[PDB]
Design a protein around this ligand. Sequence first.
Ligand SMILES: *C/C=C(\C)c1ccc(-c2ccc(N(C)C)cc2)s1
Length: 133
Amino acid sequence: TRDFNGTWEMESNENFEGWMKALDIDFATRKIAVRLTFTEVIDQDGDNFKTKATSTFWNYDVDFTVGVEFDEYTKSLDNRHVKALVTWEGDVLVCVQKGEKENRGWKKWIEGDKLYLELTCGDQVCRQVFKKK
Ligand SMILES: *C/C=C(\C)c1ccc(-c2ccc(N(C)C)cc2)s1
């Protein structure tokens, strides 16, 4: 399936700490963030995605069109300029963010009724799993 529409509730989060540290997120922010449950709301219409991550203390929204490069400034994360591109590899949605950090980006897919997210930066991978609400 290629349909990521829905409200998705975090049920599993692995190495969130390592990933944030690879992005040079400040220690105090990491200390709180690694504790928190996140919810991801995805609105998808063909290539057009609008996504919104929420937690008690932090939000992170990003909209994109699959196949269309977009310059990104990651304000509420690590405050860097990257060139971002989201494309399909089969049923896996793949984002590459070209910039200072190598191997930076993510992958999303569905297996069964669950959303899987792999976040990458440098040699660090964070893996998250969400259940559909
Ligand atoms: C497709 C999934 C994306 C773009 C994201 C999932 C989680 C994100 C995130 C986690 C933590 C923070 N802070 C600043 C604590 C920001 C964003 S993005």
